Recover the amino acids of this structure.
């Protein structure tokens, strides 16, 4: 999206590891239905949390290098980073409501 950062293996360090703030990274794939189901929701979140976090997506087929580094086994997986370090791990599709709660609880 407009506000979502579209990540690559090469831009991962700069976009995620070096950002001064919180980043919600979504590891996903085109063949993964639940990944597709959460896409519109990640869009709303990126609007609503503007100034508090940035949403980023890494497609793990197009960028196969980064997932192994974080032990990612299954998708979708959402990893909350705070200044380069994973604060919180979430796995599986959740609803908008569940995601708000995940974020509010871990951003404090």
């Amino acid at each position: 999206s407009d506000k979502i950062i579209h990540l690559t293996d090469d831009s991962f360090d700069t976009d995620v590891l070096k950002a001064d703030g919180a980043i919600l990274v979504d590891f996903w794939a085109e063949w993964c239905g639940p990944c597709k189901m959460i896409a519109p929701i990640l869009e709303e979140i990126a609007d609503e949390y503007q100034g508090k976090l940035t949403v980023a997506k890494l497609n793990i087929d197009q960028n196969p290098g980064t997932a192994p580094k974080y032990g990612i086994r299954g998708i979708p997986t959402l990893l909350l980073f705070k200044n380069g370090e994973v604060a919180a791990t979430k796995v599986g599709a959740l609803s908008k409501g569940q995601l708000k709660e995940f974020l509010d609880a871990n951003l404090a």
Remarks:
- The first strand starts at residue 5 and ends at 6.
